[PDB]
Structure formats: structure tokens, C-alpha cells
Write a protein that binds this ligand. Sequence first.
Ligand code: PQN
Ligand code: SF4
Ligand code: SF4
Lengths: 29, 80, 90, 73, 738, 150, 141, 61, 39
Amino acid sequence: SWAPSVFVPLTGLVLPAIAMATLFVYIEK
Amino acid sequence: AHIVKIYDTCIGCTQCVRACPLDVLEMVPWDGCKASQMASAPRTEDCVGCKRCETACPTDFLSVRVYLGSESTRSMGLSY
Amino acid sequence: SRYFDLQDMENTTGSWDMYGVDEKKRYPDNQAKFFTQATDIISRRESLRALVALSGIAAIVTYGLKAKDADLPITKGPQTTGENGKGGSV
Amino acid sequence: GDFLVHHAIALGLHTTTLILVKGALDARGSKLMPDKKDFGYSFPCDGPGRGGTCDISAYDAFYLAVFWMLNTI
Amino acid sequence: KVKIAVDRNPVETSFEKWAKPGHFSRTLSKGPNTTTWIWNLHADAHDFDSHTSDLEEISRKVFSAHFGQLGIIFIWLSGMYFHGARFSNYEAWLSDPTHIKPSAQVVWPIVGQEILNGDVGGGFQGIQITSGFFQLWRASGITSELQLYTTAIGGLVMAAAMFFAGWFHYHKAAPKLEWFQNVESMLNHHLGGLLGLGSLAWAGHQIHVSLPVNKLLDAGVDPKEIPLPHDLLLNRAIMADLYPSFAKGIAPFFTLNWSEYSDFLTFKGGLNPVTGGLWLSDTAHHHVAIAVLFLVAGHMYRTNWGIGHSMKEILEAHRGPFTGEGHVGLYEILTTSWHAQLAINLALFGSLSIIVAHHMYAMPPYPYLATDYGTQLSLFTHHTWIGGFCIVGAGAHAAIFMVRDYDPTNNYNNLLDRVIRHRDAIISHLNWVCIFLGFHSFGLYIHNDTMSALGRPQDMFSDTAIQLQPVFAQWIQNTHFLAPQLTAPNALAATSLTWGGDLVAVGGKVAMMPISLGTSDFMVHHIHAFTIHVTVLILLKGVLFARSSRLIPDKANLGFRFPCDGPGRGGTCQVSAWDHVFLGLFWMYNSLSIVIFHFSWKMQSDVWGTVTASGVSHITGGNFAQSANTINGWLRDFLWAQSSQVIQSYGSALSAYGLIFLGAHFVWAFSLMFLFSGRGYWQELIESIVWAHNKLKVAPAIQPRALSITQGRAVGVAHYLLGGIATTWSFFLARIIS
Amino acid sequence: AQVISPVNGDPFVGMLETPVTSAPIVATYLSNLPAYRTGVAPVLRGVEIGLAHGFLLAGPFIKLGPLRNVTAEIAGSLSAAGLVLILALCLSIYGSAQFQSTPSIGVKTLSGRSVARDPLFSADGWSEFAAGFLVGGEAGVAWAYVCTQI
Amino acid sequence: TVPTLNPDTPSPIFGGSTGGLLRKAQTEEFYVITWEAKKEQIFEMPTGGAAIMRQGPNLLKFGKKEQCLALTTQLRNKFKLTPCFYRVFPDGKVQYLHPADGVYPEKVNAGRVGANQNMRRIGQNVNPIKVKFSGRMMSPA
Amino acid sequence: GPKRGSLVKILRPESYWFNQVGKVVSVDQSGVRYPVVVRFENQNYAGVTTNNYALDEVVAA
Amino acid sequence: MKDFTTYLSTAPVIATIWFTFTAGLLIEINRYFPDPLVF
Ligand SMILES: CC1=C(C/C=C(\C)CCC[C@H](C)CCC[C@H](C)CCCC(C)C)C(=O)c2ccccc2C1=O
Ligand code: SF4
Ligand code: SF4
């Protein structure tokens, strides 16, 4: 419960959140 | 835009110019054929690539060819 | 009665602002000052990708890590003894 | 029961290879389209004229071949 | 001056054109070079508009074509009667309805097919029918086979007469354009003669034949012992004895003492408790009223005397602010285009056949109908289908009008113009509403599946956990059962038990009972409404932009039926109106398929079953309300569980349904080859095969060609529908019969 | 007299001026809203729009949620504060791509005279909106659970 | 011979449709068509709708050149008339298009040299190994 | 060129009638490249029964 | 009747007058010789 409480929601949201953000800017600009 | 070429097997029956929806082709004088005329593609930036021109050609094999190439706002039929 | 003018290059195509009235501020003297000063430091666009992203992760990593039955049924965990499998397993 | 199913699988093999081989050998040229090699491996068609030319490219041949892969295995 | 106008002997009647296939078009008449010829000549066989520009010749063709159709249909009706007379159990069935299965087909003894002759009762071995003829026959008062024979021979004569009629009205005396355009007269005569005198004379049959014979049968007296229906006419002593008001003859009719006819002309409603069908007396009075209504209605329009309305006048009158000129120009259109009329008529027929299914679902009008579950499921599914198809057809032809007949210069119309000018808003809004509906219907089922999988039943959309009650529907049901007391006093019971109470049962089976409506029903209806809206999206988009769009402005010149306009403009696959009809057929199939599944599960779970000690055991034990809320529930509780009887139908009378079960999957899957592929591959394949032929000097003169793109699509959709429908067909019938 | 007519005279522009679209009213209400105002600086618009959605998102996550059957409004509170901060990413990232050089709007009014162009569409424009959507959203969320809870 | 002047003339009668102009006409290139209709007779709007033509000079507004050459071929075939048509840009410039050299492209006019005209049979093209290591295609040799 | 109505094999590989037979309609006596106008019994895909060929793309057999 | 016979000698008519023949033949032979898995 120590590790997977942190790494699951970061891989679930925070990796795709900034990936969809920084890849969007790569496409359009 | 799309590439459109006319080869020397053209008879100059003019069907491919008369068929086009976007006026890409025209007829020019020549010395090769019984009709004394050949087809030409000076306006390919307006070419959409719908291939009516090809469908209209009587020669065997076709003496117009449309090679679908790099696509621009006009070639993609956009009104928006 | 002619909509065809090269000199009038904006009226032609129909780029008319449909409901874009050019009226004065109906917004109050005291209140417009409350919410200019309050929303002027967060204004800049570069600061949002630094604040909203990192402080937003600090919002997930706070209310995300904070682990009992009280709020969700997984950090609760298994509260009964293991069930028997199909191939006589634990 | 073993007998029938192996011949079903043989059907699987030979037909998928029919699509793939046909697609490979007619990648360059055919009677419908002698200049296919000028266009390359994937193209939508060559228009509606002279009958219609949907799924003419070797690309599309492989595409069709995948369905038999799937069915056979 | 509406009058009889005819051309004398316009076409000679020798076989000179039989022997010339494709005579009808200058193109095909030249003969075949390629195999494509063969297809084309069948494709355009009935397409008269492309043959000729003359509206006269087309008009002559169309109904003679209709006389031919009617001939065929008579011959079909002849068929059923004869078999019902010759190869059936009906007399056995006219003596113990409860314990005989209706059968009117026998197999010949060869090739093991003998097993199909199943144990159907009355000492007869055969195929159990689900057409519902046996009940028609009881309703019509038919008692013996001889009668069925005589009806059959009459239908054959009528077939001959219709065929004669069709040759005649093309080859000897073909009516003039003027003729066909007498719309007011046509409408009046069809309303008053056909419908009016039809239901009037029928009501004659019902009052003189149906009602008496039915009471004696329901009394229980042996049918052989029952008096013959002509002796009911000449001996009214038997009619007086059965209903007293006959003693006074037709006197109460003329004297307006109609209340004395309350013996056989009732308004009771509900079901006949001894038979599980509507009162014949209610039906007799129904048809009597309806006849009068239609008869007076058929005297609306102006003909050969001043009196009467003119269609064009009423149309030109009806205009307002938002629409501009309104209905103006429509008469002229609808008197010069068969397509437009076809479009209208198909929409409303189709709608009619579906309402017929429901109203036959809720109010079983025939004896021992309700309790023959096979018949009831068959009839409702059937009629729901044909409606389905007809509605899509309406869309198809609407578009065909839109491309071929529309000409603003010659035949202007503004309603149409205004519709055309804002089509974008209509289609965009339909798009929106459809995504809405899709999410808030399917999404609910996916949500349920997820919550159910994640162990959270209290969070589901269901009567137990989530409540989505059909409050309106429940209100209307409330109003319907209380109506006989307040708003319809003279009516004894309710129209239907699925609104009221009073569970009526026959032979230990449930005829009808109150239908409970919960969350599951909320779900499926909104799925329907979604499906209908999508189908409408496709078809309306098809018809409105048939002529032009932003991509292809000159689509109108290209035709109704055509594949594409190349890979240009990014690619223009399936631009034509035909392609819209194409895709419309799939969504229609989808929609209709959930309806009949809805029907079948609904009926077996919440309605049908056996009746025990003061209680009811339903066929599937009321699982619906709890199971139909998840996709998994359909997958398992409906599909998987119910397919049981079809999957083990082998070695029985029902084995043909297992064979057809597999065969229909085959043909469905077989369609996918055509749907997923394109003729480019096929033509090259054909090049290699042709090589092989030529190598052995066995090449055909008719040059072998792959199907057109359009034909590929048509074959695809056709096999897709046939496969799907036939599979559901084998499913239900084996299921419900066993 | 026709209720429906061509767009400001021009009949060859993709639209139809119905009494739904153009009228004595509707042209006065839509201009009263924050976004459509032309003369105001780009700070105060975003707050008036941003705040509002903080209350439209607030009601929802209380009564339908997993802890609806219990922390029910604490649960619904910061979840409305979230679609705010993501919109801020969406609107800051929307802005990151578009504006490289100068604005682009229908410059004139219905009267047709060349009015000054709005800062609604510019490099320094959508920034103060994206800021307005944040400070409005986050604060505006707090007042649907200082009034329903505290 | 001279290409057409670009004056202000009144467009023909039309209640208006949704098929017409959009954002593309404002920030990209829209299109203008010119002709002298003799009488007032109705025509099919290529972007949907019924519309009455007026006598004398008539101009229309479209955002794609197909919408011109669908109409022009509908004006040229049906009514037997002869329209000119050209582009527009959003800074106020024009591009004269059709007929480019007064003569329509189907019948021959001197002073229109041949472009993209390959002078061999198509099967006399080289194989696409002989056009790698470049940015070239298979036909231009 | 070939004599009118003579049976001629096509030798242009990109033709629909390649290695197939046709009849000569008329060989144009001019400076044209494809003078030999041939007509065939069987059409191609493009609904055409006739084409033009050069003197090295025919062989009378 | 030169014309009527040409129609009777049309493809779809011949096919049907041929198939009812080679169908009957196979139904017929399955009657008097029922249920074959040899010969
Ligand atoms: C297989 C296939 C073909 C080729 C298939 C063909 C041509 C079907 C027609 C074959 C039948 C068997 C020909 C009919 C022959 C006559 C009935 C005469 C036969 C003689 C006796 C045995 C009766 C296509 O043409 C096609 C087109 C577009 C998309 C997909 C496909 C596709 O999948
Ligand atoms: S069609 Fe083929 S032949 Fe007729 S002109 Fe265009 S090119 Fe020359
Ligand atoms: S249909 Fe076949 S040909 Fe016409 S476009 Fe789509 S793919 Fe290319």
C-alpha cells in the first residue's frame, strides 16, 4: 500500500496528463 | 498538390478536359496525332484527384495519369 | 444593392460580429478592483504550466496518499479469511 | 473428426497464401493496371472508371490476407 | 370533367421481345460483351423512368405491374387455403384447440426428411405452422375443409382475373395520363368503396356467419353438428334464438331503435374468457362504425359536380410567416412523380404494419390466438420487420425523387426550398441528439456492467438500487384502466389486460395479464429511440443532400445509384443516396432486432407461462427486470440460455431449425467477404483464372467481370440481412415451439 | 412581411437570421455576458466565466457519487475544483499552440465601421482568461461547500 | 486579349442557405463568378437551394472552385450562357482564373505551352529502384 | 503499314489486348506516331473496342 | 413460335428445365436405392 498508492495514480493520470499536453504542442505549433 | 501527367498516346479527343470539375487540363497544338492537338496539365495546384479525367480517357492504356501526392487545402476539397 | 466590393474586403464574405455590442463596464467600482488585484499574479501563461501542473500533482499526491475504510473500499483491504480455489490451493 | 479439421486448416493455409502470393506477384502490374509499381504499396484505388478499382493495391491484398490469417488460426 | 380515357391497342402481344433480353434499354439491347450485362438487365428491370421519358408509358407499366403483383398474391392466398383444406389438422383442431398443435404442411417420405413430420396431434404427422391461419378460419366461421377448398379455387380464379386484367390494361385498353391524374376521384373511391364497402360487407359476414357459429363452438357443440352458415340466413329462427333482436328484423335499424341491437353489437372489451380473443361482437360493431366513417369520408373531394374540395386549393391556401409560400406547388409534384407518392406511401404503410404488430400483440383479435405463443411471436416479429423494410424504402425513393424529379424551374416548391436552405442545422442537430441518446442509453448498460463487475450492485441502474421509473407510461396505464369508469362509461372492461387487471387465461396458459414497467423497460425504450434516430439520421441525410453537398456540388448529375467520385478530395467513398440507404438498412436491422428480442424476453419472463394453485409460473421466472440491465444479462439469460432448444434440436421435428440456425450464420458471415473487400482484388484474381481458361481453350465470349462496387454492396447487405433475420427466425420458432 | 431574412442584407453568407438568432432581445443578453464584451481588458472576463462553472460542477459530485450513501460534500467539493485546473491545462495548452503573431477576428460591428480588434484572441489574451478560469474556478468552487456544508 | 475587370454588380434573388460561406472566406481564399443573364430564370444552388437569376450582370460568392465549375457547367449546358470567374484574397487582391486565355480549355487556343507532358508510353517508365536516393517520383524522367 | 482488315497481333505490353488479335481499320499515311487504328471483337474495362498503335506494335499473323 | 422457343431456350429457362431433371434423377435414385454410403 506504500508504493502502489503513489505510482498507480501518477502512471494513470500524471504520465498521460503531461504526455497529451507536451505531444499536443509538438503536433500543432 | 496532386500530380497529373499527359503521355504521348493522347488522341486529343478532349474528353478529359471536358470532364474535369476544377479545370486543371487544357488542349494545346501538337504535331504527333491525327487530331493535331494534345492534352496538358498547367493547373495541378487546383487538382483534387477525383479521377474523372482518367475515367474519361479512351486510349489504351490511359494517356492521362493522376498520381495522388502531397495534399493541400484545395486538393482536399475543403470549403471551411 | 451590391455585396461585391474589393475595397470593402470585410463586409463582402460576411465576417459580421453577430451580438458583439461595444457597451461600457456595468461591473462595479469596488468589486472590479477586488478581482483585478486578486487575479493579476496568476495572470501569466508560463506560471500556469508551473503552478497548475506541479501544485495539481501536489493536490492528487495529498488527497491520494492520505489509507483506511473511512473514505474508500480498497485501502480497507480484505476483512475475511481466504476462499478455497479449484485445484485445492490456498 | 481429426480428418475434417486438418483439411479445414489446409483450406486456411492455401487461401491465405493465395491472397498473399497474388498480392505479391501483381504488386508490379496487371491488365487492369499495368503501371501499379509507379504508385507503390498502399493506395486507395485508381478511381471508379473502367469498372472500379477498390482494394487494388498490394497493401489491400495483405489487409484481406489478415482476415484469413485470423480465421485459419 | 373526370372521365374514362383510354388508348386502344398500344402494344402488340407476340413473343418478339421475350426472345430479346434487355429490349427495354438501347444500351442493353446491343447484347453482352462482359458478364456485367447479365447483372445490369436484372438490376434495371423495373426501373421504367430510365427506360422512357414518357409519363404515359410509365403509368401504364406501373399498375399492370400491380395487377401482376395482385395475381401473384391471390395465388399465394389460394395456396394457404388449399393446404389448409388438403394437408392439415384443422378439423382435429376445430375440436380441441388447447391440445392440438396447428399444422398445414406434410413432408414426403424420402432422404430422412420424414423426421420433420412431428407429433402435432389429432392423429396427423407434420410441420407445426405459426402463420395463424387456423384462428383466422375460426374467426371467419369456417367449420369444414370443403369450405377451404372452395375458397382456394376462388382465389385461383381471382388470380387468373388479375393476370387477365394486367395484360388487358396494357395491351388492349391502356388508360390515358389524364386518367391516372384523377386523384380526387381515386381517393374518394378508395376510401369509400375499398375500405368502406369492404369493412361494411365484411361486417355483414361477421354478423351473419362469424358471430353465430362462434357462439355455438364456444358453447362446445361438435362442429359437424353445428348448422351450416347459409341455413343461418334462411332460418333466422336460429339467429333469433341466439340473439333476440333479430325477431324485429331490420325495423330497429330504420326506426333508429339501434339500442335493441345491443345483443350482437357490443362495447364490452377485454377478452372472451372461453377463448382468449377479443369479442367478435365488439369487432362487428367496430367494422360497422368504421364502414360508416370511411363511407362519409370518401365524399370529400370534388369530381364531376361543383361540390367537393380541390386538393390544389387546400394546398395553396395553407401558408404562413416562417415558411413563406408553404404547400404551394406540391399538388403538381404529387400528380407527376410516382417516386414522391411511393416515398409517402411506404413511410405510412410501414408505420402501419408496426402499429398492427403492437395492436395485435396487446389485443388478440382471433380465437385461441393469445395462447398460441408460437403464432403470436411469429406474427409480431414478422409484421415488425416488413414495416422496418418499407420505412427504409420510403427513404430510398424519397431520395430518388429528390435526384430525378426535382426541377425548381418547372415545378417550384418553397417548403422544399426552405428545407434545402437549412439542411445543415437539421443534420447537425440530429447528429447531436443521436450522440446524446447513444451515450445516455448504451452508456447506462456499460455503466451497469462495470459496476456489476466491480462488486457494486447498490450503484447500478435497477429497481433494487438505482430507480429510473417510467412515470409517464405508468400514468397513461393508470388512466387506461380507470377509463371504463370515468371517460368511457359504456365500455365494460379495459381495451387490454396489459393496462387493466383481470388476468384472463385459457387451457391453463396465460392469455394476457398486466405488464409491469420498471427500470429495465426504461432502458430498452431509450435504446430503441436511439436506434430510430440514427436510422433517420442516415436516411434523411441521404435524401436531403442527394443532389449536392460541400464535397460534391454536382452530385445530382452523377445519379441516385453510383459508387463514388474517386479518391480525390481526400477520398469520396459512399457519397451517393443509395449508399445512405445501404447503411440505413444495417441500422434498421439493428433497431428492429433489439425490439423483437425485447419482445421475446419480455413475454417469456413477465407475461407468459402456466397458471397453478391461484398463482402463476412464468416461462423464464421474471428475470427480465433484474437481468436485462446489463449486456452480460442479455448475453447469458437471453441468448445463451434460450438458444438451448435450437442447439439441441437435432434428431427431432425441429432439426430443420438447427440446420437453418447454422445456415443463416454461414450466409451472414458470407456477406462479410463482399462488404469488407473491393473488386480490384477480384478482377485480378479473375485475370489469372481467365488465363487458365484460355490455356485450355475454354474461355467464355461473355468476358468474365467482377461485380460492380454497388453490386458488391447490394449482395453484401442482402446476405447480411438474410443471414441475420433467418438466424433469429430459426431461433425464436424452435425456442417457442419447444 | 417575412419573419426570416438574409444575414445583415447579404443572402450569400452561410447562415439564416431567424427570430432565434437576431432580434431586439438576444443581441442585448449575449453582449451582457462576460466573453462577448469588446472594450474591457482581458483579466475580468475569465473570472466571471471561470467562477460560474465552479458552481455548475459543484452540485453534481455530492449526491450521485460513491460516498452519496454516507464525506459526501467534501467528496463533491475538490472534484469540482479539479475540472477547473484541467480546463486551465486545456486552456493554457489551447493557448500554447494558436497565437504566434497578432490577433484575428471579424474587425467591424453590425453597423460595419472598423472598430478596434478584441484581446479575446492574442498572445497576452488567453493567458489572463486561463488565469481567470483558475482563480474564478478554485475560489468559485469553495462557495458551493461554504453554503451547502459550512 | 484582356482579362475581366472586377466591378460591383447585384447578386440574383435568394432567401439565403446554410451551405454558403464560413471562416475560410474571412482568413483564406473565397471565389467570385460573373455572367450576363438575359432573362430572370431559376437555377440550382450548388450549395443547396432554389434561387432566381436577374437580368444584366450577376455575381455569386463561393468558397471552393468546384462550386463555380458545377454551376458554370449548369449555366453553360442548360441556359447556353457564358460565365467568367476568378478568386479573391482577404487583403483585397484578386486572381483571374477562367477562362484563363479567354478560350475555354476544351477547344484549342494558341499561347498555352504544354505542362506535365511525358513524351513516351507509360510502360517506358523506369523501375522505382532507379528513383531512390532523391526526392523524385516514377513519371518525371 | 499493314493492309486494311488484316488480322494483327498486338506487341505493346501495357495494352488490354496484348498478345491478342485485332483487325486494321485504316493506317494513316502521315507523320503521326500511332497510325495503325485497330478494332477488336471484345471490349476492355473502359468500354472501348478500338485503339491506335505504332508500326513496331503490330505483327500481321 | 420461332420466337417463343428461343425464349424457352434462354439461359434461366434451360437451367431450370435442366435442374428439375438432374434433381428428380437424384431424388428418384435415392427412393428405389435408399441411403447409400457405397455405390
Ligand atoms: C468474391 C467477390 C467477387 C467475385 C464474385 C463473383 C463474380 C460472384 C458471382 C459468381 C457466381 C457463381 C456467377 C454466376 C454464374 C451463373 C449463375 C451460371 C453458373 C452455371 C450453372 C452452375 C448454374 C466480386 O465480384 C466482389 C465485388 C466487390 C466486392 C467484393 C467482391 C467479392 O468478394
Ligand atoms: S482524354 Fe486521353 S485522349 Fe482525350 S484528350 Fe484527355 S488525354 Fe488526350
Ligand atoms: S470506391 Fe473504390 S474507387 Fe471509388 S473511391 Fe472508394 S475506393 Fe476509390
